Write a protein that binds this DNA or RNA. Sequence first.
RNA 1: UACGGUGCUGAAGCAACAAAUGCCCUGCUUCCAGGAAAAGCCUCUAAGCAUCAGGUAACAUCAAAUCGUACCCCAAACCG
RNA 2: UGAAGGUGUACUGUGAGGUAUGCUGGAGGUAUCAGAAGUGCGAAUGCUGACAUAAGUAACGAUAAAGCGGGUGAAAAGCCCGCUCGCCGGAAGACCAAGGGUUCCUGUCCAACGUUAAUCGGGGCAGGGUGAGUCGACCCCUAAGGCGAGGCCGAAAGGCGUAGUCGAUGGGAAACAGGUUAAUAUUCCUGUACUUGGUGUUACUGCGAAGGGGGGACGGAGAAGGCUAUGUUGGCCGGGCG
RNA 3: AGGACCGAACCGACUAAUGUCGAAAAAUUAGCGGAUGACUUGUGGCUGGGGGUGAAAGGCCAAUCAAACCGGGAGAUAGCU
RNA 4: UAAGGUGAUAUGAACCGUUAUAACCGGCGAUUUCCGAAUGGGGAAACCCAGUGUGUUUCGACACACUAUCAUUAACUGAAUCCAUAGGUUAAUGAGGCGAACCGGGGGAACUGAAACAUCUAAGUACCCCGAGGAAAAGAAAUCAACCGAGAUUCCCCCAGUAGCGGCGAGCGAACGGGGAGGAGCCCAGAGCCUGAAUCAGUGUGUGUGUUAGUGGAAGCGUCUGGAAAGGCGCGCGAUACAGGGUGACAGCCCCGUACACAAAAAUGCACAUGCUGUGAGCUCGAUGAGUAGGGCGGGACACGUGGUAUCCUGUCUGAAUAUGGGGGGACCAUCCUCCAAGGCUAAAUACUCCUGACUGACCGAUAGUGAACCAGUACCGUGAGGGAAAGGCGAAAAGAAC
Lengths: 60, 92, 102, 77, 45
Amino acid sequence: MKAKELREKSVEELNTELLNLLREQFNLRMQAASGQLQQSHLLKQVRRDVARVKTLLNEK
Amino acid sequence: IREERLLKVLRAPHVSEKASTAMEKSNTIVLKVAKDATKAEIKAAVQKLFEVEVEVVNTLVVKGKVKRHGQRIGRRSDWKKAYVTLKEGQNL
Amino acid sequence: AAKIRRDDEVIVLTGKDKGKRGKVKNVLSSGKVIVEGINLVKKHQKPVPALNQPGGIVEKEAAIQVSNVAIFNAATGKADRVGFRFEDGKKVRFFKSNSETI
Amino acid sequence: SRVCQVTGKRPVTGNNRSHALNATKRRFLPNLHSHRFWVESEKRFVTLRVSAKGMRVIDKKGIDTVLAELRARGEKY
Amino acid sequence: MKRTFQPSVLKRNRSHGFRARMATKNGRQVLARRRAKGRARLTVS
RNA sequence: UACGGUGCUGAAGCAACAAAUGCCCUGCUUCCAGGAAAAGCCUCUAAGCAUCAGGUAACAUCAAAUCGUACCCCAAACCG
RNA sequence: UGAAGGUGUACUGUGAGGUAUGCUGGAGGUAUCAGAAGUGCGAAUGCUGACAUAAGUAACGAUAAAGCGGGUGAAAAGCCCGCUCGCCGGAAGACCAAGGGUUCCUGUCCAACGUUAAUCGGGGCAGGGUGAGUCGACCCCUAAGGCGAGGCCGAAAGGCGUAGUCGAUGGGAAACAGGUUAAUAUUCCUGUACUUGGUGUUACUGCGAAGGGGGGACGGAGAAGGCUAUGUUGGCCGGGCG
RNA sequence: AGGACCGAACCGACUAAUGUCGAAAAAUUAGCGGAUGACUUGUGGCUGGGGGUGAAAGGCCAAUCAAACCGGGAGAUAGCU
RNA sequence: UAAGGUGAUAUGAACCGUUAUAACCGGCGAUUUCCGAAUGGGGAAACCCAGUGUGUUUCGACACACUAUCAUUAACUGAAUCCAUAGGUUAAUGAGGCGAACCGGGGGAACUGAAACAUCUAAGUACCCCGAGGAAAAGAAAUCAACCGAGAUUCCCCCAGUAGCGGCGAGCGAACGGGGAGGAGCCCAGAGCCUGAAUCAGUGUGUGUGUUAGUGGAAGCGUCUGGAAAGGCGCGCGAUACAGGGUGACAGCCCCGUACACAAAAAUGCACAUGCUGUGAGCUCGAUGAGUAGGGCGGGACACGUGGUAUCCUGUCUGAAUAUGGGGGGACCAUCCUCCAAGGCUAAAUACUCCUGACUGACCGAUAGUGAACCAGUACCGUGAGGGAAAGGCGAAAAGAAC
Ligand SMILES: [K+]
Ligand SMILES: [Mg+2]
Ligand SMILES: [Mg+2]
Ligand SMILES: [Mg+2]
Ligand SMILES: [Mg+2]
Ligand SMILES: [Mg+2]
Ligand SMILES: [Mg+2]
Ligand SMILES: [Mg+2]
Ligand SMILES: [Mg+2]
Ligand SMILES: [Mg+2]
Ligand SMILES: [Mg+2]
Ligand SMILES: [Mg+2]
Ligand SMILES: [Mg+2]
Ligand SMILES: [Mg+2]
Ligand SMILES: [Mg+2]
Ligand SMILES: [Mg+2]
Ligand SMILES: [Mg+2]
Ligand SMILES: [Mg+2]
Ligand SMILES: [Mg+2]
Ligand SMILES: [Mg+2]
Ligand SMILES: [Mg+2]
Ligand SMILES: [Mg+2]
Ligand SMILES: [Mg+2]
Ligand SMILES: [Mg+2]
Ligand SMILES: [Mg+2]
Ligand SMILES: [Mg+2]
Ligand SMILES: [Mg+2]
Ligand SMILES: [Mg+2]
Ligand SMILES: [Mg+2]
Ligand SMILES: [Mg+2]
Ligand SMILES: [Mg+2]
Ligand SMILES: [Mg+2]
Ligand SMILES: [Mg+2]
Ligand SMILES: [Mg+2]
Ligand SMILES: [Mg+2]
Ligand SMILES: [Mg+2]
Ligand SMILES: [Mg+2]
Ligand SMILES: [Mg+2]
Ligand SMILES: [Mg+2]
Ligand SMILES: [Mg+2]
Ligand SMILES: [Mg+2]
Ligand SMILES: [Mg+2]
Ligand SMILES: [Mg+2]
Ligand SMILES: [Mg+2]
Ligand SMILES: [Mg+2]
Ligand SMILES: [Mg+2]
Ligand SMILES: [Mg+2]
Ligand SMILES: [Mg+2]
Ligand SMILES: [Mg+2]
Ligand SMILES: [Mg+2]
Ligand SMILES: [Mg+2]
Ligand SMILES: [Mg+2]
Ligand SMILES: [Mg+2]
Ligand SMILES: [Mg+2]
Ligand SMILES: [Mg+2]
Ligand SMILES: [Mg+2]
Ligand SMILES: [Mg+2]
Ligand SMILES: [Mg+2]
Ligand SMILES: [Mg+2]
Ligand SMILES: [Mg+2]
Ligand SMILES: [Mg+2]
Ligand SMILES: [Mg+2]
Ligand SMILES: [Mg+2]
Ligand SMILES: [Mg+2]
Ligand SMILES: [Mg+2]
Ligand SMILES: [Mg+2]
Ligand SMILES: [Mg+2]
Ligand SMILES: [Mg+2]
Ligand SMILES: [Mg+2]
Ligand SMILES: [Mg+2]
Ligand SMILES: [Mg+2]
Ligand SMILES: [Mg+2]
Ligand SMILES: [Mg+2]
Ligand SMILES: [Mg+2]
Ligand SMILES: [Mg+2]
Ligand SMILES: [Mg+2]
Ligand SMILES: [Mg+2]
Ligand SMILES: [Mg+2]
Ligand SMILES: [Mg+2]
Ligand SMILES: [Mg+2]
Ligand SMILES: [Mg+2]
Ligand SMILES: [Mg+2]
Ligand SMILES: [Mg+2]
Ligand SMILES: [Mg+2]
Ligand SMILES: [Mg+2]
Ligand SMILES: [Mg+2]
Ligand SMILES: [Mg+2]
Ligand SMILES: [Mg+2]
Ligand SMILES: [Mg+2]
Ligand SMILES: [Mg+2]
Ligand SMILES: [Mg+2]
Ligand SMILES: [Mg+2]
Ligand SMILES: [Mg+2]
Ligand SMILES: [Mg+2]
Ligand SMILES: [Mg+2]
Ligand SMILES: [Mg+2]
Ligand SMILES: [Mg+2]
Ligand SMILES: [Mg+2]
Ligand SMILES: [Mg+2]
Ligand SMILES: [Mg+2]
Ligand SMILES: [Mg+2]
Ligand SMILES: [Mg+2]
Ligand SMILES: [Mg+2]
Ligand SMILES: [Mg+2]
Ligand SMILES: [Mg+2]
Ligand SMILES: [Mg+2]
Ligand SMILES: [Mg+2]
Ligand SMILES: [Mg+2]
Ligand SMILES: [Mg+2]
Ligand SMILES: [Mg+2]
Ligand SMILES: [Mg+2]
Ligand SMILES: [Mg+2]
Ligand SMILES: [Mg+2]
Ligand SMILES: [Mg+2]
Ligand SMILES: [Mg+2]
Ligand SMILES: [Mg+2]
Ligand SMILES: [Mg+2]
Ligand SMILES: [Mg+2]
Ligand SMILES: [Mg+2]
Ligand SMILES: [Mg+2]
Ligand SMILES: [Mg+2]
Ligand SMILES: [Mg+2]
Ligand SMILES: [Mg+2]
Ligand SMILES: [Mg+2]
Ligand SMILES: [Mg+2]
Ligand SMILES: [Mg+2]
Ligand SMILES: [Mg+2]
Ligand SMILES: [Mg+2]
Ligand SMILES: [Mg+2]
Ligand SMILES: [Mg+2]
Ligand SMILES: [Mg+2]
Ligand SMILES: [Mg+2]
Ligand SMILES: [Mg+2]
Ligand SMILES: [Mg+2]
Ligand SMILES: [Mg+2]
Ligand SMILES: [Mg+2]
Ligand SMILES: [Mg+2]
Ligand SMILES: [Mg+2]
Ligand SMILES: [Mg+2]
Ligand SMILES: [Mg+2]
Ligand SMILES: [Mg+2]
Ligand SMILES: [Mg+2]
Ligand SMILES: [Mg+2]
Ligand SMILES: [Mg+2]
Ligand SMILES: [Mg+2]
Ligand SMILES: [Mg+2]
Ligand SMILES: [Mg+2]
Ligand SMILES: [Mg+2]
Ligand SMILES: [Mg+2]
Ligand SMILES: [Mg+2]
Ligand SMILES: [Mg+2]
Ligand SMILES: [Mg+2]
Ligand SMILES: [Mg+2]
Ligand SMILES: [Mg+2]
Ligand SMILES: [Mg+2]
Ligand SMILES: [Mg+2]
Ligand SMILES: [Mg+2]
Ligand SMILES: [Mg+2]
Ligand SMILES: [Mg+2]
Ligand SMILES: [Mg+2]
Ligand SMILES: [Mg+2]
Ligand SMILES: [Mg+2]
Ligand SMILES: [Mg+2]
Ligand SMILES: [Mg+2]
Ligand SMILES: [Mg+2]
Ligand SMILES: [Mg+2]
Ligand SMILES: [Mg+2]
Ligand SMILES: [Mg+2]
Ligand SMILES: [Mg+2]
Ligand SMILES: [Mg+2]
Ligand SMILES: [Mg+2]
Ligand SMILES: [Mg+2]
Ligand SMILES: [Mg+2]
Ligand SMILES: [Mg+2]
Ligand SMILES: [Mg+2]
Ligand SMILES: [Mg+2]
Ligand SMILES: [Mg+2]
Ligand SMILES: [Mg+2]
Ligand SMILES: [Mg+2]
Ligand SMILES: [Mg+2]
Ligand SMILES: [Mg+2]
Ligand SMILES: [Mg+2]
Ligand SMILES: [Mg+2]
Ligand SMILES: [Mg+2]
Ligand SMILES: [Mg+2]
Ligand SMILES: [Mg+2]
Ligand SMILES: [Mg+2]
Ligand SMILES: [Mg+2]
Ligand SMILES: [Mg+2]
Ligand SMILES: [Mg+2]
Ligand SMILES: [Mg+2]
Ligand SMILES: [Mg+2]
Ligand SMILES: [Mg+2]
Ligand SMILES: [Mg+2]
Ligand SMILES: [Mg+2]
Ligand SMILES: [Mg+2]
Ligand SMILES: [Mg+2]
Ligand SMILES: [Mg+2]
Ligand SMILES: [Mg+2]
Ligand SMILES: [Mg+2]
Ligand SMILES: [Mg+2]
Ligand SMILES: [Mg+2]
Ligand SMILES: [Mg+2]
Ligand SMILES: [Mg+2]
Ligand SMILES: [Mg+2]
Ligand SMILES: [Mg+2]
Ligand SMILES: [Mg+2]
Ligand SMILES: [Mg+2]
Ligand SMILES: [Mg+2]
Ligand SMILES: [Mg+2]
Ligand SMILES: [Mg+2]
Ligand SMILES: [Mg+2]
Ligand SMILES: [Mg+2]
Ligand SMILES: [Mg+2]
Ligand SMILES: [Mg+2]
Ligand SMILES: [Mg+2]
Ligand SMILES: [Mg+2]
Ligand SMILES: [Mg+2]
Ligand SMILES: [Mg+2]
Ligand SMILES: [Mg+2]
Ligand SMILES: [Mg+2]
Ligand SMILES: [Mg+2]
Ligand SMILES: [Mg+2]
Ligand SMILES: [Mg+2]
Ligand SMILES: [Mg+2]
Ligand SMILES: [Mg+2]
Ligand SMILES: [Mg+2]
Ligand SMILES: [Mg+2]
Ligand SMILES: [Mg+2]
Ligand SMILES: [Mg+2]
Ligand SMILES: [Mg+2]
Ligand SMILES: [Mg+2]
Ligand SMILES: [Mg+2]
Ligand SMILES: [Mg+2]
Ligand SMILES: [Mg+2]
Ligand SMILES: [Mg+2]
Ligand SMILES: [Mg+2]
Ligand SMILES: [Mg+2]
């Protein structure tokens, strides 16, 4: 995804970060605590996909 | 008002008898928050994420239990819990 | 540069089950293959309450060392040892004596 | 500290030999005094903690010549 | 019948605490020793 | 009544007397050995500033962050 | 087709020893002649570990005291519940600070821990439990004292000390009664309050310090009055007729 | 009024017995002295080893004192066992 | 590089992948909470309290920035006071701390030995402090020799336990000369013609690299015993590979390696071309380091303890000539010889190893070897400085004993 995600606008690349933080990370973090989330692997890849975006928007 | 960061505060909903009794009888929610997490930040987080009318937040820092097992001592994390009181307009 | 790998017919060189042939289920990180129908060890599986609870003895396919097996030729009809040639732009394996590609 | 501003005469150590050669450790303080020198250059007095032999260097050379050397090292006066 | 150790956490840190060692030339050397020996407990704190 | 307690109701709910080492009293009398300091607080103006900025009331609103809170604490939990 | 090591047996040399082999052991050993030594232990009130002896002996930690019934349990003098009995009561009761730090509460488990047993436990193993505008801390201010720009002094390290800044054991704003949890409550709920700041409308209007003055702001003992917490006795109300 | 009197708290430690591998590396039991002052005590300071402090016993300075404790000189030295 | 991965105790769950955006292994970036020199102020380290500007906002508010100290350098702007300095706002640049030894300097013991002990010894040793650098320090003669001549420092072996020193006791102990390792010299205290040409100190440019990832990498079979073959037995074969390790017992040929030939997108440490902000060549004439050398007094360093004591350094008080001069040649003098102090910078041989590799032991094999083969500087002990343990091995494979 990094290669496709490189070529994006600065304002538009925030919206993916805010989408990764709004739902996904939070939703899965809350859902995993209750014990309804069977698929535990989603917590990892999202945390890395944040890091990816965070690194990619550090262009200056 | 403090966008992005508000999402990191609320960790999980707390499950217990004291938690369960305070849902119906007192109209509150008990939940695990971040180590930082001020009453304003928790209120503002619950106001956005859970989307409910917050009356007042009451915070307490739980101490980590010392669990010696096998041969080594080992202590738990000092998690913070927030008794968040809601208004008359409430939900699960 | 692993000589023995997944979908590969091997023959056992040493040990009880000497001379038998089979395919590798999965080569481990420790440096040990698990070939099917080779080291059949009769484990006494204790009945765990959660999930399945059979409560009976079972024949498990135990691990064997990589050195104790060699790849089967299927031409000469015996064990053969592996090299690494550069046919085209790829490090491909080959049989020492009867230089063919797998 | 007991150090001459001009010559750098600091207090050295030595032995205090008795008639029976009993070496008891002592120290040689230099002859320091807080003296005021008239500098003719800028029309003023300059207080310098100097040894008696320093004063003779200040009289041998010029006070300005010594104050030139003092400032070269990075000192105050 | 009243023993030597009569603890007080203020006195502990005031007397033997990290900053109380850091304050002095000699106290810095203590820590430099505990670090050199490689202790987990550098000072009581 | 799971035999733990919950739910509901609930009469009188006064008077004298005594009385502290408590409180008025950080007071009063007295004695000498003659009994911390500094802010908050109140007040007056300098340097300033004049339809300003400030005060002052009145009502409104907003807020009051963070940390400790269990339990032992003349003791089987502290020092021995 | 069984090494070293362990353990027996039979030969053998003048001795330190040597040879062969049974069992155990399950993989190393080493002729001969040379070479080098951490080269031989019974003692050192030797040093470390293991195990004896006294010995199934003393002791089981206040002479405040138990008795019986029922319960659960493999099992009950000790645990639970009940009825008596005894002991403390300016404490052996109840709240705090200091200091401990989960010892609190519930469920379960007795290997070790408990100077006995243990179903019980401050024991082990899970889960739960500490909710503050008002209590305390942090915060505004200082004493003793500490630190200490420049500074003076000191062979170097550093010593002392000024403006400052820390430092409570002291000074400075405000909440109580009731209910409630298995475990928290002056915090949760219920009632009724209070204080300090910020920011707006209105009606007035001379405000403003690193400065001045007031206050804060103070000893011992004594004596006396007025009270209150609190008690006792009536009345009153509900029950009792032994 | 009082370094006044008697006497609890509090502070002490005169006598006796018990204890002496103790319940306790200084205590218990019954009596005992002071108990508004040269009193006693909480919290925090300051004084450091030939140094402190001492109503002075060579007392006390972390169960250690006619010179603390820990590390170093250091395997001091020993005509001694 | 790659077919298997999601570190371990440590199975499991849920998933990645398999010809290439899995994993892994390197280069260069990114993030880098809080304490810690800690640096906005404080503070009982990992906590508590701030201001000025910037961008935003729905009243509540966040957000990122910046603020330590000193040291030089610059502008400022300013006392007592005329000028002024003293001071004070802001600005650059640097320093602060930590680390095993080794080095130079500032201070500096005692036990002990002398069969006691005071000079002396131990010894400028331990220790404390300051400043360093890959090394450091020393260093181009005011050196030391003997009418022969040698030509800077440093380190090794001799000279030599010699000459000396010494309560002439205990003890301490040279130089000359010689053999070696390594070699290298220069700048200032300045005036002509002529000037970028030797030189370096950068921005560099050149290959060669070396290094931090790597690739290929030879040739064995059959029987016998056994749980298992690498073993015995019998025949092969590779060897610039029989170093070593693993594998169910001892493997050249089963595997990982080994010898040998190849590798780097990127960062770097080297040795030569060489464009260069920037630096000075040949040769004239004249300079040659004053409170200094020496001296008195008191100490110290020289092997040399004031002794008949040269030499150097100095705390103290004094004081030349200054190259038709001065130092030295071990009291001193006179002749000869030799150097030229009172200012600087200089590589190599030399010392060390906290640390990174590789390789080797007539080193140890769990009471040994590090205190520590093991979650050890841990448990535990101590107010604290500080002290400080014990504890290894099932088996080839968990096939860890279903019932
Ligand atoms: K009275
Ligand atoms: Mg998916
Ligand atoms: Mg509330
Ligand atoms: Mg709170
Ligand atoms: Mg932890
Ligand atoms: Mg590989
Ligand atoms: Mg390879
Ligand atoms: Mg000296
Ligand atoms: Mg004298
Ligand atoms: Mg001496
Ligand atoms: Mg003067
Ligand atoms: Mg006593
Ligand atoms: Mg003790
Ligand atoms: Mg103290
Ligand atoms: Mg102190
Ligand atoms: Mg570490
Ligand atoms: Mg009355
Ligand atoms: Mg009273
Ligand atoms: Mg009274
Ligand atoms: Mg009164
Ligand atoms: Mg009073
Ligand atoms: Mg007030
Ligand atoms: Mg007021
Ligand atoms: Mg008002
Ligand atoms: Mg606030
Ligand atoms: Mg309580
Ligand atoms: Mg309670
Ligand atoms: Mg109690
Ligand atoms: Mg009590
Ligand atoms: Mg009491
Ligand atoms: Mg009490
Ligand atoms: Mg007790
Ligand atoms: Mg008691
Ligand atoms: Mg105890
Ligand atoms: Mg046999
Ligand atoms: Mg046998
Ligand atoms: Mg044998
Ligand atoms: Mg023989
Ligand atoms: Mg023999
Ligand atoms: Mg034999
Ligand atoms: Mg045999
Ligand atoms: Mg072997
Ligand atoms: Mg052997
Ligand atoms: Mg042998
Ligand atoms: Mg031999
Ligand atoms: Mg033989
Ligand atoms: Mg023989
Ligand atoms: Mg022979
Ligand atoms: Mg021996
Ligand atoms: Mg023995
Ligand atoms: Mg003997
Ligand atoms: Mg052992
Ligand atoms: Mg018996
Ligand atoms: Mg007996
Ligand atoms: Mg008997
Ligand atoms: Mg008996
Ligand atoms: Mg008995
Ligand atoms: Mg008892
Ligand atoms: Mg007894
Ligand atoms: Mg009793
Ligand atoms: Mg009685
Ligand atoms: Mg029953
Ligand atoms: Mg039960
Ligand atoms: Mg039963
Ligand atoms: Mg049962
Ligand atoms: Mg029964
Ligand atoms: Mg039965
Ligand atoms: Mg009974
Ligand atoms: Mg009983
Ligand atoms: Mg109670
Ligand atoms: Mg506490
Ligand atoms: Mg404890
Ligand atoms: Mg516990
Ligand atoms: Mg309990
Ligand atoms: Mg049970
Ligand atoms: Mg039960
Ligand atoms: Mg039992
Ligand atoms: Mg069990
Ligand atoms: Mg028992
Ligand atoms: Mg129970
Ligand atoms: Mg428990
Ligand atoms: Mg409020
Ligand atoms: Mg307050
Ligand atoms: Mg000071
Ligand atoms: Mg200063
Ligand atoms: Mg200092
Ligand atoms: Mg200084
Ligand atoms: Mg303050
Ligand atoms: Mg206080
Ligand atoms: Mg009020
Ligand atoms: Mg009630
Ligand atoms: Mg209840
Ligand atoms: Mg109340
Ligand atoms: Mg009250
Ligand atoms: Mg009302
Ligand atoms: Mg209200
Ligand atoms: Mg009001
Ligand atoms: Mg107000
Ligand atoms: Mg101020
Ligand atoms: Mg003021
Ligand atoms: Mg007072
Ligand atoms: Mg008065
Ligand atoms: Mg009074
Ligand atoms: Mg009265
Ligand atoms: Mg009245
Ligand atoms: Mg009353
Ligand atoms: Mg009343
Ligand atoms: Mg009463
Ligand atoms: Mg009465
Ligand atoms: Mg009557
Ligand atoms: Mg009555
Ligand atoms: Mg009547
Ligand atoms: Mg009636
Ligand atoms: Mg009636
Ligand atoms: Mg009735
Ligand atoms: Mg009096
Ligand atoms: Mg009296
Ligand atoms: Mg009397
Ligand atoms: Mg009395
Ligand atoms: Mg009493
Ligand atoms: Mg007593
Ligand atoms: Mg006594
Ligand atoms: Mg008594
Ligand atoms: Mg009495
Ligand atoms: Mg009497
Ligand atoms: Mg007194
Ligand atoms: Mg007193
Ligand atoms: Mg006391
Ligand atoms: Mg006292
Ligand atoms: Mg002190
Ligand atoms: Mg001192
Ligand atoms: Mg000393
Ligand atoms: Mg005394
Ligand atoms: Mg005496
Ligand atoms: Mg002790
Ligand atoms: Mg004594
Ligand atoms: Mg002494
Ligand atoms: Mg020595
Ligand atoms: Mg000895
Ligand atoms: Mg890995
Ligand atoms: Mg893992
Ligand atoms: Mg593994
Ligand atoms: Mg794993
Ligand atoms: Mg970085
Ligand atoms: Mg920071
Ligand atoms: Mg900073
Ligand atoms: Mg700071
Ligand atoms: Mg402050
Ligand atoms: Mg600070
Ligand atoms: Mg602390
Ligand atoms: Mg902080
Ligand atoms: Mg901040
Ligand atoms: Mg600016
Ligand atoms: Mg914040
Ligand atoms: Mg700024
Ligand atoms: Mg700036
Ligand atoms: Mg700045
Ligand atoms: Mg500055
Ligand atoms: Mg300057
Ligand atoms: Mg001007
Ligand atoms: Mg002025
Ligand atoms: Mg003027
Ligand atoms: Mg001017
Ligand atoms: Mg100047
Ligand atoms: Mg200046
Ligand atoms: Mg530095
Ligand atoms: Mg060394
Ligand atoms: Mg040195
Ligand atoms: Mg001596
Ligand atoms: Mg002697
Ligand atoms: Mg002797
Ligand atoms: Mg003697
Ligand atoms: Mg010496
Ligand atoms: Mg010497
Ligand atoms: Mg340094
Ligand atoms: Mg080097
Ligand atoms: Mg260099
Ligand atoms: Mg150098
Ligand atoms: Mg030099
Ligand atoms: Mg020389
Ligand atoms: Mg020549
Ligand atoms: Mg000779
Ligand atoms: Mg003599
Ligand atoms: Mg000579
Ligand atoms: Mg000579
Ligand atoms: Mg020579
Ligand atoms: Mg050369
Ligand atoms: Mg050269
Ligand atoms: Mg290359
Ligand atoms: Mg190969
Ligand atoms: Mg074979
Ligand atoms: Mg054989
Ligand atoms: Mg043969
Ligand atoms: Mg090799
Ligand atoms: Mg080999
Ligand atoms: Mg091998
Ligand atoms: Mg090996
Ligand atoms: Mg074997
Ligand atoms: Mg072999
Ligand atoms: Mg062989
Ligand atoms: Mg062979
Ligand atoms: Mg390249
Ligand atoms: Mg290249
Ligand atoms: Mg390419
Ligand atoms: Mg770089
Ligand atoms: Mg010269
Ligand atoms: Mg001379
Ligand atoms: Mg003369
Ligand atoms: Mg002379
Ligand atoms: Mg004379
Ligand atoms: Mg002299
Ligand atoms: Mg020297
Ligand atoms: Mg000497
Ligand atoms: Mg002589
Ligand atoms: Mg001289
Ligand atoms: Mg002369
Ligand atoms: Mg003259
Ligand atoms: Mg000449
Ligand atoms: Mg001439
Ligand atoms: Mg002449
Ligand atoms: Mg001479
Ligand atoms: Mg001569
Ligand atoms: Mg010359
Ligand atoms: Mg000269
Ligand atoms: Mg020269
Ligand atoms: Mg000189
Ligand atoms: Mg060089
Ligand atoms: Mg060279
Ligand atoms: Mg290599
Ligand atoms: Mg060897
Ligand atoms: Mg061995
Ligand atoms: Mg060991
Ligand atoms: Mg062993
Ligand atoms: Mg080591
Ligand atoms: Mg550890
Ligand atoms: Mg302890
Ligand atoms: Mg400790
Ligand atoms: Mg079993």
